[model samples]
Target chain A: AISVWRAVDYVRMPWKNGGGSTEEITRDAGTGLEGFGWRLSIADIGESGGFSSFAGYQRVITVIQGAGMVLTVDGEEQRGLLPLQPFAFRGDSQVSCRLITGPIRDFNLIYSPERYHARLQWVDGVQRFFSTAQTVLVFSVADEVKVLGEKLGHHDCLQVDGNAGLLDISVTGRCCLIELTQRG
Target chain B: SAISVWRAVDYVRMPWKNGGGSTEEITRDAGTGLEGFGWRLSIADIGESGGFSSFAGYQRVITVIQGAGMVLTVDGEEQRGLLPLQPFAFRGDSQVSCRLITGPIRDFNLIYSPERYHARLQWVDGVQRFFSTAQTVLVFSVADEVKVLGEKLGHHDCLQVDGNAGLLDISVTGRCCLIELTQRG
Candidate 1:
């Protein structure tokens, strides 16, 4: 079954940084970032600042709106950060951000690598793929996205859960796809 | 030791008896020509409004899986709206007629013979564990990862246990339709 999370229905939460505020898109389980298997959030970064520490987790970040940011990760200056281009970093990295143009909103995915194997990417146009992941999430940034006969607006997410075998998933328009399978 | 997994991609597609559409055969016990089967499970794609084929002595349960919904008239008594994921049962001998509430729809079915075998069906969600004395048990999944007795099944896949001579314990996580059947003496 498909569960659609609309942008209007998103729950807003205070960012761990205490400076950036985030919209809670969805999570596998848990609350307040304590016991979840994985979490997806959109943070509106208003200015350059230090990111919160998430020691034992893994993170994937992508710019969804506005320009982008330059990241200084663990003494390394990462350049050419652009929209739709996702970057993965260890949750425990000493990271700080600086705006490339102005304020920007980025999609954040944090997952416990010990519990699950994950795959993620950005895709556009009419696309189809089969997955054996226990969970598949589609976050749409388009005005309208068609998937599994259902429609999604900007910031809307479509979550498919309980998969243990191959599932034929199809979508129309651009979106970020995340697939996860619990470690057996 | 009796359990086996039937993948959705491997399901056989056959036309409906009345030729209105096609039926995706999940798994069935004995026979395939829409007759002579003690029990059968299948999914159908209904593209147009029409009448259903009569099955004299068998009993059937139908559930809408896709599209908006459909209306069924059983032996002249109109059913109480067949909504998505909701199962409805009727006599196979009944003159069944269908009308689309919207456009086309997809549905799954469970047809069994009362004299030949006793059957029970129910749709469940979340983690479930139970013990049954039935000889045959089938779990048709709708969720991505459905675990039946520790075995994992994919979406639209089935986990089947057959020839159980005694009580069997089962565990399942996620949403699915459970079916139990016992051969009549």
Candidate 2:
């Protein structure tokens, strides 16, 4: 089953810690914010501050816009994060953010270790992929591209169940590939 | 047990499993091929709009990396508008088609066999802090410059840390993707 979810249709919610807002892309039904096994969302940060705490969740973030920002984790400066670059950290840690060039838009993925295992990657040009997990998501980061011969525009994704064998695909620009598996 | 860095220059180009457009092989388990391995990662360039090749026993994740983007129609449902960064999920055996929303674009991919491995992928910009329990975690720089674990990473430069189960601190000035893979129980 394939459904295309638009940015405009994304569900809006407050940060779990109440520090900001989150544009939720998807989450497990009934889990809401506090107990969802996994989630995908975007946040617009207008100021420098500490990130909302998500203690048991594994978190990954990528910049979507602006000059970027610097992250000070657990009182230590890690480095500056710019557009498209992703950084991973524990959801329960003492993580803080400070704008480097200015405010920024970021993409985030959070999941519970006991429920699911996830992987994200950035790929450019023609490629092939195989899946061993139960779920796979293809996200277009470029203006337009092709997958399994199908045209995918920016933000459009092609989801796949791990039951398939192999895939032949190509891209003219760039994209992010997300793979997820249910854990027992 | 260690962290491995893969330079863009080290990637190998290989034919798609279904023999369609070619794929640039980034990393895969030893002995990866059509008969299959455990998991695989790669990138590709879509020069034309057409049907996506099918993979019967595997799951797939694809993201746009360059160009404008494209429109996807799955099982006859047309999803006309798609852009960069955001991701979508579906089944591998579903009937799928594509229409160029703008022009050609590049894409990233992750495919794995469900019986063997569990995986996770995310995009982050700026900075973040977290604890990790993944057996294998890979960080790939998307922009021209990035610094992590005290090392400078350029465009397409990838840093991989395997056999880790502790705290993770990441700060970057550019964009990148983080991938975590683990053996399934």
Candidate 3:
């Protein structure tokens, strides 16, 4: 049984000389990302821009803060993504965003094809919740909100297991959510 | 830039017996938790409990689910915590969950000292959202119904960071969100 605290604090990224996104990355402990789990993060990019690409994984991305954009995935169907909206596809899927606004913040949950399989979603506020049968993740997109009984700010991460399914949360404000799963 | 996918996928926790919770955690490479840069999952005992003891580090906790309860501290003065209501203090100086009707589902976060980070919040229909900052951590709760950018969100889903400061997320189905931050000094 371990006790913990809320994580709040934002680090600034440099903007592109013209106008685009700068990336910050969380490192994994292992080598080659082989037999490694998957997840990704990218922030603030301009219209008609490209996203960092990854291999050997599936990815789900969402627009946290933005004026909404149109994403051409692998040059297929152009999907319109707004704030708090999530998009899923192959991590290697040729993806690009056509922003309706200027710059935007986007988040991603990636899992290795061999180690895990997962999904990402955006939920509403005020309700009891739970996980289905895998590793689950919950993240905030808005300024601040509440879950179960505690309040959380932006950029906070929560990891839930398959056994500990179902959760109860009340939103103090509006936000976004991402869900991840592992396959045997 | 360091491109590690594992860091973005936070290990999560789940509900256990009666009203308890257990979680899968991630620690610094080669190093176990209770040290630098780690993540955790937890549940709050609601049947009868209040005020958690403190550990010297960083943590972010949220009520994943809960019954009627109050958390109060008696060290210096007296504090009361009614969950799903607001964000309270968790520095160990304050006692929590004075009493509860049933059990409260809670998730916690811990990081090594010298690692400075933060956690914010966002709420939608029954679902809560957590966005990661540049070199930050992101967390969230569960949901029955959720929709984002025309996608769906489920319970115990999370996104980690180390790249990009602006993360965009949206939930329109059910409620669930708890986000935390972690960094090195």
Candidate 4:
């Protein structure tokens, strides 16, 4: 009843700075990203250097592979951003990055606070919930788990519309939960 | 600044609120409960044909991972013959019902508060190259085998990348989900 997107199906694109490339996960088709309200993407950071800045946007990052990196945001050195652990910062601030081990791949989420409110969390094992947000995304992090007796694989997601009453279901594996509520 | 990989062995299990089912919780807000939370992510299996449980103030995004397909009726509108790997979005408060097009199917979901978050989800295949300027991006592999930046990933593996204007040079032989999230301005 939903769309299961495979990794090979995503559109591959270059980074804005041209310093690297990114796999564009999703964006506002109408406005693109320059004036976009929200954006999600994956970057292959081959080297440690300066990071592109997105003024007026709030950002969250998590490492997916490699060693890790130390971030210098507005003159402050932020250490310890590893795999699956999310780190957030303001987009307007001056930022730079240095790898802890070497190269790395990371996942990112950015949103304009004036347009919407966003929340991302990492969880493991079986989880139960009833939500009231306008939108909810359940992303499977592992392979072969039961969701309402149906089997879900890695990177698979369950999107629930929240305007109705509480959605009752069960999951039997690892996944990420994303909830977004738009502001008027 | 490096950390560790979150393995599947660490996931937590819980009983469903309605007690009709059980769930494996991945993550949620600190004070999340059966009634509500800011946002939440989890998986579930649909074994029977019936009305999909509704959520009053939320939007939903669903992707079928297993089984054939199904038909969805939202409010009075009928979306018949939905296929796999295709996502459908609708209001959570509407009168929604589902009929299995085949037998049973598993699905992925993304639900959030439209009042507070702005988000987008897309599926792409046969994509060779392009450039991305999104603030944040998540890449999930849908194929049985895939390689990115010389790294191999199997089904359901995810790669999350952050930054603006970062370059991505990846090749996939299958399919994937590209997710974008941002705060409202």
Candidate 5:
């Protein structure tokens, strides 16, 4: 059992011209992904109307730096994701978007097929937890957190042993979680 | 490429003597592992001294909590990680302890091996980062982060992702970051 990992720090990748301006970071590189695998990033959808295509992979996103926006997933009922509200959708869906007021910045997670599986979501105040996997990743939004008898700072992560089950984690702030299923 | 993941909510297991403790949620599961590939929950050694063992194959660590702890390298320099200080070391050959000048607390990280693993560490306040492999894990230290964009991060507002990387990235609100790298077989 081997667990490999990567820390894709914040990178500001400018879109050619037609896309929204956004800053992003690849969280994990997938199988056959020579240099990297998974990905996490923030988009600055300054445009009043737009939506990017994911092709097929699944995606989880939350408005981290935006006030609000109306997300139309495959022309479905427009849903509003304000502030800390988390949302999930298929990457292949023909999703579209419309800014509620102005420019919006949000966080996103994307994964590939035949390589791994993943789950993404938002978390509120203090809580505890345990893990069962060869890998685990923890991302913080708050500047401080109290867990396992220690206080974690923003961006601090906790990786537990897969067999080292039944551990506890308690947070005093807010955070996001990304779990991965590796492929060959 | 295949990304397997699950959302971990609720207290799955409390490995503490006290009822009031930390909260742990899993991010990813590599394969079947015991030595090389494995993620861990945060464990604060409150006001005490204990045994520090090797993470078997290899491991990388970041201090999520604070206090005075002396991490002695069995054959290297003596390193001490303070609260909100620098991200110490990713070496897998050292004995760590919490010589708490105060009490025990919480800390988080992504641990893997060099032979077949890699990881990156980012201490928000410090922005100290470590990304070792292609496969990665991301967790936060919120419970106390009250500042974002010169303000504060409210309750349960974050981004989680695991996927193929043609282009991947993320920026922190205050001191948060994305750890990216790859793992070997």
Candidate 6:
């Protein structure tokens, strides 16, 4: 039904600035920022830092580890980020972050908006939903999670290469759903 | 006909043990886990060539329902090319994988425990009639319109009859696959 990407399999890739490494979860074909239309990764921030600039893209982020952070978008008001709470903002804007306490880890999704239309929702408990999308990505935050009947561990990603109409997805535990559709 | 018809929309997509492709569960014979299922009918979409997951003890009958087809390599030996509407049977215990002959394809599978059930699977076309004494029967329609035992079936619709009494006569119109299972014990 879907493919699983185990969290333990994630490789760490240090940022160009060398402040800290963002755990490489998964990404589509691309060389760095511009080429990739869709990407998912984990960022472990040791200290507050400036968000990377990626013009023409949109980002959906949510804290996964620790108390979270207070983020600011240049043109928008500051939003207090909490674990499991998704925050959406344009990557083209000037963004900065400040930790609530110490270091924290957060999940990230960045994709070109002009070339794609998307929806990202964070849900928990026992729930099921019907969907029709070109692609569906489920990133689990709960230590125990399963899509349909297959087991998925914490931080594991379930990717559905769909076209199979009316997929009935019943997921247990907390996770984020990312649906992507082409703009043609 | 004692029929229960299932549509394409309600099919449950069950993950493969190998995670190489998509497997949408069509129906199960009141079964349990992967290793313990009595019998299962599922549809899988395959485009890429890769190794298949191993399952010991069960018998696997596979057929190409859509697209060109492929040749399966079972434990190093290449089997004949499985073209559209052609059914192939192999041991679930054997190591199996395939090479796509042309583009992507969709296939249907019947996995039944070899020691627990006597299974018969055949892909049928045109107007056909049959009488079977098997405990269970399945008619899977490959076309948009199929008539199973005089009942209309939609695309990918499956008509199932469990604990079928006696040797009942059944007729099917359109392209379909008929599967019958008789319990061993």
Best by lDDT: 1
Model 5: lDDT of residue B145: 46
Root-mean-square deviation of every model: 18.9, 23.9, 19.9, 22.9, 21.6, 14.2
Q: B1-185 in candidate 6: lDDT tens per residue?
A: 24456566545464555655677776676533345767888899885888887778888988888888888889888576998888888898899888887877889988988878898888888999998999889988888777876556666777877656699888888988888998887
lDDT of 4 by residue, A140-168 (tens): 65786566555657655555443445656
Best by DockQ: 3
Q: List the candidate numbers ranked by lDDT, top first.
A: 1, 6, 2, 4, 5, 3
TM-score, candidate 3, chain B alone: 0.55
Which portion of correct inter-chain contacts appears in model 1?
Answer: 0.00
B72-157, model 3: which lDDT tens digit per residue? 55454665555663444455333344544355444333323334444454434443444444454333335433343333334444
Q: What would the DockQ be for model 1?
A: 0.01
> What lDDT does candidate 3 reach at residue A21?
44
Interface RMSD of the candidates, in order = 19.8, 19.2, 13.5, 17.6, 16.5, 19.3
lDDT of 3 at A104: 77
**Which should have the higher DockQ, number 3 or number 6?**
3
Tell me the tens digit of each residue's lDDT in model 1 across A45-152: 988888876888899999988878888889785755699999999989998888868888999999989877999989999999998888889999899899987898
Q: What DockQ class does candidate 4 belong to?
A: incorrect
In the range A135-180, model 6's lDDT, one tens digit per residue, is 7888888788878666778899887764559788898888898888
Chain A alone, TM-score per model: 0.93, 0.84, 0.70, 0.82, 0.75, 0.91
Per-residue lDDT of candidate 1, residues B66-164 (tens digit): 788999888787466899899998999889889987998989899998988999999999989889999889998887778777666666777777668
DockQ of candidate 3 compared with the true complex: 0.05
Clashing pairs in 1: A162-B144, A162-B145, A163-B144, A163-B145, A164-B145
Off by over 4 Å in 1: A16-18, A30-34, B1-185
What is candidate 1's CA lDDT for residue A12?
A: 52
Per residue, candidate 5 scores C-alpha lDDT tens digits across A101-150 of 78787777777654565666557686666655444555566676554444
